[PDB]
């Protein structure tokens, strides 16, 4: 099948209930051995006498694509309208999935993941309180610049780096529809790895874990407008949608709450919620 | 003839027998095989030591006790000292292999108890001290079993080994999604998992990357009664399969 | 160079509607989400067995 | 002093130098390590974030025509550390260059990596190992010949080389516009 | 094209070049190859590490001086520490292999001197003290050159290394019957002998038996004049060929 | 007068997707960037030799 050729599906419905009659025999479909590592492929008709039901149900929304391909917020960043002197006049984000709780748990249900991605970004502005907040501020244009691992970081809201002679950038004016890009499978390895039980150094040391593999570069944000008399603050929300997805090695979903965006740390939680008695209604 | 409870596995100059097995799990449906010309990237000729590497290495066996919480081993690292596999892993930047994992544990009709035997790919474990980072010596003792803890705390940069969260922030009862078997003392005396090379890249460094972790966790505690043999060990023997190595230089660590 | 495909409709009381696709960009990454592939193979997870386990038979013998 | 001069390009060799002596050593980070970094290959690499492929270092002897010598040209893949001795270097991928009428010998460095691509930027995960040079025997000369002489090294990319993820270079900048 | 003086030999991750060779001697007319099913006796599968074992190992090079009497090395023992060949030789009771021996020595048109380069099978050496027996440390320093003596005497259980009798009671001028070449500094800068497995039995132990000895003996003394480069070394690089090993157990010596 | 062409996809595990082009303007200058021509000839730079240099042979003789 070709995950990039969207308009090319496969309709697979759920299994029908075949009619069962009474039995008295040596065959035992519901007596087995869990030790084997095998899951019982029993159907209700092996235990009861069932009728004939035609299941036209399809496992549609549980497809890896339909599950992951809904655009989620991964991070938001903030920056004011200012001069070279103002540190806060621009900002940046090192790209990472592990910053938020919700998409992270979804992706982490799979060890290895290969996908293309749709990035949408909602940049929002607000007037700072000031004697000058009265001010005719013109429409603000914004610049989002991707700096891949190795290129020049912008040190100020106003330096050569923002030229983008080779880095990808998006210039976006306010009031318009949210900015949107598609990204290929950017990794150096044959699949993205949500987990790495290993080290950054051959000597079993340095950085432990997934961090080591997931070097994605960073997004730099600024206003293109010169500052109005009163400051205006903008905050950019970066949205991710995994499209054209393939997934390998399913994992148990995260039980414990996330602590660090850097590492897989947790503090131990109970297996489930407690109940009144082992016999419950 | 042929009772399906009886099994004989031979690999290199090694045969393991069992007279109470419960089938054998081939990891994710795939039997191990060599890296193909399409999937390759390292351009140099691989060395494939076959029988010299691909044979049954018995690691240091652990004792199962009534209250003992559990054990883990890390591969390929557990084998870093096992004969010529270890040497090849020591002299090569890159290595690749699948494995026949055979866990052994015998007791008696009168004993009871049940252990989960599971091969978890990329089991990246959490630091006990959530604030800090973990470190190698608390992640792996090579061929010696690292133990799971019933206690929710540990020494500086030790892993959070609290059993019910499997050392990695999840429900231990869901570990079953990974290639696994169970040695339930009523039913069987051994487990066998044939694990393929599961990774996001064709070959990798044998030291840096612990490709998967073998976890043996007792879900039903070991028990027996009035004077009926106390000592009952669990022995893990493992054989590398389709092992090949690229990038040769000097003895390696740093 | 247009592609015609089938829309997700639903089980009708005892049908086929179509939609049109034209890829506008030079890069397959730019394409719509692969949402219509309802293919599956639980076997690798539900049954990773070397010896085939026949349901009507005893698991151990 | 020598980097703002022609000395930078010429590696100094000498007669009566003892056998296992190291000529030079460095880790292979094309586009990141100062030795290869700002060469034609290095410069091209610096407009990209990912590279792949085999590299070839062509060693040319610019000593006296009447002079002789043999050198071990080594490439150690990562994981073990830089080869400390000619024996350590010997164990890795290597050419023993005998100098003679064919002036130059090329050390072809193979792409040996876990991944299909490495970063142009130095990264612990995408480490590429060490290329080192050693006297396999020694440089020998006749009577009125110069004792010290020089070798020189050319570098380029083989037909399996490629680059990805286009980016701006750190190698050029400005504070204001030019006039 | 193709001057017969120029040669390039590649084996494993190893290439040696020479621009002044004098052909290459294939020992007794036979190129090395693996032990065949007819000639075999050890019933176990052999491990054949190919490129990992069969590659160019440069041993500790010696200095040639005007009065220096000569040198010998013993195989396979000289290679007991050379990478994975050494390891395989260490973990196996039996081993078998042929070898590409490449001796290197460059000087100048103005230098003069000539060395015999010879591979002597079963060169069983005599004790200097005729009454007594010799011993290993005076028979082989592994990869380090054991020297021939101009002096007719030596320390307790040292070999009688007096050059004109080649350490074995014969005329050194007759050593030429064994596979040999000469590096005559006028003519060439290297020698290459491809030695087959020569022995009375299909495989043998890699430590106990020194299957052959490499002798480098200066028949015409090294000479040069007034200020024309004093230091001129002789480097021996050797590559195992068609190497295979039987009988695997633990790390071996005793 | 539409043009159908091939999209950049990627090496698949052991394919062809298309895109559509219609030139809207009267001037070829107005057209999309020529990004899909991976043609090359290093020869002029790597080998500007009058006499062909055969790799297995000595460079000088
Ligand atoms: C203005 C141009 C912007 C270009 C943005 C490039 C963004 C690269 C995104 C990389 C997403 C990586 C997903 C990693 C998933 C994971 O392993 O957790
Ligand atoms: C095949 O592609 C030709 C079928 C008719 C095409 C109608 C095109 C619709 C308008 C142009 C879309 C062009 C996108 C670059
Ligand atoms: C060939 O060009 C005819 C194929 C069908 C054309 C569909 C045209 C799409 C809409 C008009 C675009 C006109 C641009 C001036």
Swiss-Prot record, chain A:
Residues 1-14 are annotated as: Amphipathic alpha-helix. It is found in: Virion; Host cytoplasm. It comes from the Viruses. Interacts with capsid protein VP0, and capsid protein VP3 to form heterotrimeric protomers. Five protomers subsequently associate to form pentamers which serve as building blocks for the capsid. Interacts with capsid protein VP2, capsid protein VP3 and capsid protein VP4 following cleavage of capsid protein VP0. Forms an icosahedral capsid of pseudo T=3 symmetry with capsid proteins VP2 and VP3. The capsid is 300 Angstroms in diameter, composed of 60 copies of each capsid protein and enclosing the viral positive strand RNA genome. Capsid protein VP1 mainly forms the vertices of the capsid. Capsid protein VP1 interacts with host ITGA2/ITGB1 to provide virion attachment to target host cells. This attachment induces virion internalization predominantly through caveolin-mediated endocytosis. Tyrosine kinases are probably involved in the entry process. This is Capsid protein VP1. It comes from Echovirus 1 (strain Human/Egypt/Farouk/1951) (E-1).
């Amino acid at each position: 099948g070709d995950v990039q050729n969207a308009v090319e599906g496969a309709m697979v419905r759920v299994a029908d209930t075949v009619q069962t009659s009474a039995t008295n025999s040596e065959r035992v479909p519901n007596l087995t051995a869990v030790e084997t590592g095998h899951t019982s492929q029993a159907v209700p008709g092996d235990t009861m006498q069932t009728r004939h039901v035609i299941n036209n149900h399809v496992r549609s929304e549980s497809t890896i694509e339909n599950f992951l391909a809904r655009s989620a917020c991964v991070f938001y960043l903030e920056y004011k309208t200012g001069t070279k002197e103002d540190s806060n006049s621009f900002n940046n984000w090192v790209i990472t999935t592990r910053r938020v709780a919700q998409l992270r748990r979804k992706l982490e249900m799979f060890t290895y993941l290969r996908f293309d991605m749709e990035i949408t970004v909602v940049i929002t502005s607000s007037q700072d309180q000031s004697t000058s907040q009265n001010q005719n501020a013109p429409v603000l244009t914004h610049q989002i610049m991707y700096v891949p691992p190795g290129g020049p970081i912008p040190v100020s809201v106003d330096d050569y780096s923002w030229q983008t002679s080779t880095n990808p950038s998006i210039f976006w004016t306010e009031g318009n529809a949210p900015a949107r890009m598609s990204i290929p499978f950017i990794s150096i390895g044959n699949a993205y790895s949500n987990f790495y039980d290993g080290w950054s150094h051959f000597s079993q040391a340095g950085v432990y874990g997934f961090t080591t593999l997931n070097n994605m570069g960073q997004l730099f944000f600024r206003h293109v407008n010169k500052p109005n008399p009163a400051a205006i603050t903008s905050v950019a929300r970066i949205y991710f949608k995994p499209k054209h997805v393939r997934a390998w090695v399913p994992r148990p979903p995260r039980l414990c709450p996330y602590i660090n965006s850097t590492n897989v740390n947790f503090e131990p939680k109970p297996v489930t919620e407690v109940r009144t008695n082992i016999i419950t209604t | 003839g042929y009772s399906d409870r009886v099994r004989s596995i031979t690999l290199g100059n090694s045969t393991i027998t069992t007279q109470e097995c419960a089938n054998v799990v081939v990891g994710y449906g795939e039997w191990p095989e060599y890296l193909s010309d399409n999937e390759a990237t390292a351009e140099d000729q691989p060395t494939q030591p076959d029988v010299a590497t691909c044979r049954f290495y018995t690691l240091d066996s652990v004792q199962w006790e009534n209250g003992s919480p559990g054990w883990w081993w890390k591969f390929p690292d557990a084998l870093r000292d096992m004969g010529l596999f270890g040497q090849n892993m020591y002299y090569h930047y890159l290595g690749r292999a699948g494995y026949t994992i055979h866990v052994q544990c015998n007791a008696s009709k009168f004993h009871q108890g049940c252990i989960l035997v599971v091969c978890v790919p990329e089991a990246e474990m959490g630091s006990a001290q959530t604030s800090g980072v973990v470190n190698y010596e608390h992640i792996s003792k090579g061929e010696i079993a690292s133990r799971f803890t019933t206690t929710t705390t540990a020494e500086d940069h030790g892993v959070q080994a609290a059993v019910w969260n499997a050392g990695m922030g999840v429900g231990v009862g869901n570990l079953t999604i990974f290639p696994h078997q169970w040695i339930n003392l009523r039913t069987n005396n051994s487990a066998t998992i044939v694990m393929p090379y599961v990774n996001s890249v064709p070959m990798d460094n044998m030291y840096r990357h612990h490709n998967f972790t073998l976890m043996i966790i007792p879900f039903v505690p070991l028990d027996f009664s009035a004077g009926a043999s106390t000592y009952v060990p669990i022995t893990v023997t493992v054989a590398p399969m389709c092992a090949e190595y690229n990038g040769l230089r000097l003895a390696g660590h740093q | 160079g247009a592609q015609v495909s089938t829309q997700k409709t639903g089980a009708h009381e005892t049908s086929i509607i179509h939609y049109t696709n034209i890829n506008y960009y030079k890069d397959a990454a730019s394409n719509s989400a692969n949402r219509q592939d309802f293919t599956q193979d639980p076997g690798k997870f539900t049954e990773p067995m070397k010896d085939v386990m026949i349901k009507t038979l005893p698991a151990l013998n | 002093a020598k980097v703002s001069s022609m000395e930078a390009y010429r590696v100094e060799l000498s007669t009566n130098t003892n056998a296992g002596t190291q000529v030079f050593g460095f880790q292979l980070n094309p586009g990141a390590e100062s030795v290869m970094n700002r060469t034609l290959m290095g410069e091209i690499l610096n407009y990209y974030a990912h590279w792949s492929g085999s590299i070839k270092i062509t060693f040319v002897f610019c000593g006296s025509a009447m002079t002789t010598g043999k050198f071990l040209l080594s490439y150690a893949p990562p994981g073990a550390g830089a080869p400390k001795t000619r024996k350590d270097a010997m164990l890795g991928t290597h050419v023993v260059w005998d100098v003679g009428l064919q002036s130059s010998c090329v050390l072809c460095i193979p792409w040996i990596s876990q991944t299909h691509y490495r970063f142009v930027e130095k990264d612990p995960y995408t480490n590429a190992g060490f290329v080192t040079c050693w006297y396999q025997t020694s440089v020998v000369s006749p009577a009125s010949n110069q004792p010290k002489c020089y070798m020189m090294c050319m570098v380029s990319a083989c037909n399996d080389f490629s680059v990805r993820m286009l980016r701006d270079t750190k190698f050029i900048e400005q504070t204001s516009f030019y006039q």
